[PDB]
Ligand binder design. Structure first.
Ligand SMILES: OC[C@H]1O[C@H](O[C@H]2[C@H](O)[C@@H](O)[C@@H](O[C@H]3[C@H](O)[C@@H](O)[C@@H](O)O[C@@H]3CO)O[C@@H]2CO)[C@H](O)[C@@H](O)[C@@H]1O
Ligand SMILES: OC[C@H]1O[C@H](O[C@H]2[C@H](O)[C@@H](O)[C@@H](O[C@H]3[C@H](O)[C@@H](O)[C@@H](O)O[C@@H]3CO)O[C@@H]2CO)[C@H](O)[C@@H](O)[C@@H]1O
Ligand SMILES: OC[C@H]1O[C@H](O[C@H]2[C@H](O)[C@@H](O)[C@@H](O[C@H]3[C@H](O)[C@@H](O)[C@@H](O)O[C@@H]3CO)O[C@@H]2CO)[C@H](O)[C@@H](O)[C@@H]1O
Ligand SMILES: [Mg+2]
Lengths: 421, 421, 421
């Protein structure tokens, strides 16, 4: 049996009082990871090569995820059965070196570690013909699925409350990669086309986006004994809300009281990202991110995001170092023009089973500090039925109430373990 | 650690629209498997031989099942802890080669793959003395348990709504097998006696079946480089409803509104089955089933079922083939004399890690087509309290409403993976 | 992959009728284990040494628990994700042979097998520096966490029903062990200090205990080819209710109707324990316990407990024996002075993969008998709101109703498997 996974777990305290807290800017889709994670998360994989004959082989892989709050010993939970697929390599003579697979599978995800941000991820149930050799590069083809909670109607109503049927969305993906545009660099290009796939007779709301596009282009340059990635992405409509490759063409959301409300995503998104990790000499390592994301919706509720941070590691011993992370966020509401922002600074002393910023297990002892000043928030007060502004960006003092995290401070500290195997 | 299991997973589309659908005749207890399965199901076993001394050994086995809808990546679920038992072989000098075991264990199940139909299965918590050598054959003894949701009353009421206590049922099993009645053939005989085991003072409903019998006789003949099984079974009363060896002597069911209703199973069942797989030459393999099942209940709500289908595999390469399945069902209501029926035809191109119809992993790409015409259905409209005909067979247009699947068509298609290890 | 666990599973019957029952004295915190367990419980561990360099190594461990009722095959359940931690040994040059760890981990538990009683157990999320060599003995340091369901208020109310916020408690532990006070004996000493850690601004009830102490001293003497432990413990206030090392300084409980009620634990506890297992010759083994526990609360609802039992094993063969267990309990209510008591006698014939009372797998076939006479019970009738005596000790006939198990008899029997690996 093969055994792999990821897991993080720990214990912490908040400067002001009680269990530890985590800090994320209202409107941003991420937080600066170090000494700013508040869960025990864990994926346990058990795979195995079940048959081999020369070049031909069949591999079986599975994944079961657990997420608990780590406030107690016995903590019951509903695990997620995230992957169970079979991949057969070299089984098709004519297209050599390629694989065909079917089943639930995490499929070629692209992410940014220090902010735990996945920027191109279409995993889920699916199937595909992977790694076909096109000479100048490798070309892969796949189809995956997602399905939104409700959003379709059995008959034609004018009442959004009748659109409660789960609505399926398909994604068709095509990538061309490992092209050496330059010396040291490579270029990957991909096209994603998604669409809500309606049951015979069902109907979507009026004006629902329905389908959409995501265009990705990623360049990898080898540098300072490490690397640098520069991405640029462009999304359209039903692909703007998730923004990783998955489609939500129905435009209907739901309150905690089962009331349907309208999230319509016609619009577009533009992403410009650059991240990497470089080694400078023998005693330093350092990861870094810089991103600007702009979701512009017709519905006028989009946002414009900016981030930057760096994680420099300095090594006393081959297995003892001092890590430091500094991050800055700033989100501006499309609807109101206000701006929310924050900055965090963490200081940690770790012991890892490695000599790299990328090596783990790791055992940290840290201290984090954050100061934010938010001037807007989302209005989730009331009910999708009571409230008409339900789920819209609204200023910090809108109608004498108060939205957003405010303008304060805080510091937390503790011990943590993190590890991929 | 030992690692074994079963798992199936995939992606599909319905000709008419949306996610894929599966087809099963109303009244039949099975569907023709190929390109007609709509879940990600998976059992993960982790066992181990914990002690051996010569002939003596102690084996530890466990099983944990997962079933999700494969419409998304993160799909939480409550797993079933299905087996955790210990078997010790040769530990009793006097009866050599035999095992004694205790714990939850799948125990000697007999099924029919293409229709995924288990026809003799009494697994659950239990214990037994297995494989005693009686000279002309092997004789095994076991006791397993089941318990129905409610069905007993603390005091004597006349109101069925007072019969809500979980009611336990025990099964006592005896089999005599591996007897060579003829050359190439073998004969197994088994007797099952089950009964509801009431708590001190509790009482069952008036007229409740209470106990019952299942008699099995299975002949296996070696043929065409494969085999053929011919079964004949006979059940009585509290063994007719489940019809695999488990007992339900209480006769009380429950609506989705927690209202008790009366399912009384006094009557009998007669099963005549013949299935097998044969190889004809070097380029063809083919599985086949033929069955006739008649449940006759006093309560007049039984049914009379008929099935036939064949799955012929033709192999282009030692690892690439074209499979085809064709199935026919026809169920007639005891209560109304009407008949429901259907026929399915699937065509698939697979790649397996084998050269057999029985070998897997397998990766299929298929298309299925079905046409049914149902003339009756079960009335589950209303409430066990609102409705008096709750859960009874009723014609297709009974009281202007409509029961059954109707008289239509459909075709689906997709990709799937399936594998036992 | 490393694979370990514990698991017990089986099938049983009650003399009087139905599934088997288990017997525990009202007020006692344990039952005499043999042929007196009614669940399928199982922990499945999968660990692994992920990196080693000479003396230095990093170990990864995990645990997932399942508990089902064994009344059926398919039994769904919510598993508990109990441990996921990383321990790195010898990573700190200056303090050699010591480990530093972080994550959810079972940490140095001390228990009493025949009564399944854990008397010093602070496991949960946490971190620590383990096994520092202090010359005359080994000194370890750790901090673990727990959190009670509710018990804090956002503002200052006088209504206990406003104290519904989960309230966290930290524990700080220090032990000094492996000191050879005498020849053959050793001495461990430990101090535990726990306290509810309130969020900025939240408040506890008036008079809430808040914090507390647990003092442990355990002496182990090597004897009769086995051993003997003699413990003495002393707890104070917020450590008296759990009484194993975990803190509950809030004093607020909840009915099944979400109504807060007051459990206040100011008081103290005194524990005197002596247990062990000895071998006498070659044909006998025998475990034994003797304990006296007195929880004295200001609130006057404490109890005074007494137990004694012995489990003598006599071995026919190196792998076939006859086990016997005899236990006696007697609890007296602090509030009413009444006394509850019981005695059990079990007789079993087992087959184990060992020659010891401590060796398993084991497969038992047994019969148990118990006779009790309880004269008081807890009043859980009504609601924390309806009832004012909710949850208090009350005599057996208080207000014409009836509390406690009464004065009866019973006998059960069956087969079971049990195994740690
Ligand atoms: O295994 C490689 C991978 O390990 C780590 O990624 C894990 C994350 O740490 C963990 O939070 C989780 O990520 C989730 C994202 O937060 C969320 O945006 C969404 O996409 O679901 C994710 C769950 O899959 O899981 C991943 C891995 O399963 C590490 O951060 C990565 O650097 C590394 O690529
Ligand atoms: O492992 C041998 C076994 O593998 C396959 O059987 C699995 C079925 O595919 C799967 O559906 C499931 O069967 C369930 C039945 O549908 C149901 O009638 C009832 O009896 O519960 C069953 C769950 O145990 O599980 C089995 C195996 O666990 C394959 O179909 C068989 O040919 C083969 O014998
Ligand atoms: O693995 C060593 C350990 O095995 C056995 O202990 C298990 C118990 O049999 C099992 O009931 C369970 O114990 C629970 C206690 O009943 C309860 O008081 C509380 O502390 O939670 C416990 C769950 O951890 O689990 C343990 C082991 O996980 C055996 O009894 C012991 O002798 C032995 O030390
Ligand atoms: Mg659940």
């Amino acid at each position: 049996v093969d055994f792999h996974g990821y897991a993080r777990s720990g214990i912490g305290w908040t400067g002001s009082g009680g269990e530890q807290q985590c800090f994320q800017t209202t409107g941003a889709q991420s937080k600066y990871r170090l000494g700013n994670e508040c869960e025990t998360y864990a994926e346990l994989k058990l795979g195995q090569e079940v048959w081999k004959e020369g070049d031909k082989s069949f591999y079986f892989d599975t994944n079961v995820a657990y997420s608990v709050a780590q406030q107690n010993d016995w903590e019951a939970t509903d695990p997620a059965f995230r992957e169970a697929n079979v991949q057969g390599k070299n089984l098709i003579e004519w297209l050599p070196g390629s694989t065909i697979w079917a089943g639930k599978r995490f499929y070629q995800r692209h992410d940014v570690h220090m902010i735990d941000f996945y920027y191109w991820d279409i995993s889920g149930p699916g199937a595909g013909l992977e790694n076909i050799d096109v000479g100048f590069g490798k070309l892969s083809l796949a189809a995956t699925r997602s399905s939104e909670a409700g959003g379709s109607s059995s008959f034609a109503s004018n009442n959004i409350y009748d659109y409660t049927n789960e609505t399926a969305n398909d994604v068709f993906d095509v990538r061309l990669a490992q092209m050496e545009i330059n010396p040291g660099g490579t270029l990957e290009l991909g096209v994603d086309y998604g669409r809500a796939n309606l049951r015979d007779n069902y109907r979507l709301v009026d004006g629902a986006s329905k389908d959409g596009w995501l265009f990705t282009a990623e360049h990898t340059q080898s540098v300072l004994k490490g690397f640098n990635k520069f991405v640029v992405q462009y999304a359209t409509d039903s692909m703007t809300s998730q923004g990783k490759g998955l489609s939500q063409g129905s435009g209907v959301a739901f309150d905690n009281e089962k009331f349907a409300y309208n999230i319509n995503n016609n619009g577009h998104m533009l992403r410009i990202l650059d991240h990497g990790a470089i080694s400078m000499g023998d005693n330093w390592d350092m990861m870094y991110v810089g991103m600007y994301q702009d979701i512009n919706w017709d519905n006028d509720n989009g946002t414009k995001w900016w981030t930057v941070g760096i994680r420099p590691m300095y090594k006393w011993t081959p297995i003892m170092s001092t890590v430091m992370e500094i991050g800055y966020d700033n989100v501006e509401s499309q609807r109101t023009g206000d701006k929310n922002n924050q900055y965090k600074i963490t200081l940690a002393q770790q012991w890892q089973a490695g000599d790299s910023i990328w090596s783990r297990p790791a055992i940290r002892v840290f201290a984090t500090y954050a100061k934010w000043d938010e001037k807007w928030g989302y209005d989730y007060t009331g009910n999708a039925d009571n409230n008409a502004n339900f789920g819209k960006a609204v200023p910090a003092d809108f109608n004498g109430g108060s939205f957003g995290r405010g303008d304060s401070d805080e510091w937390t500290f503790g011990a943590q373990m993190e590890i991929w195997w």
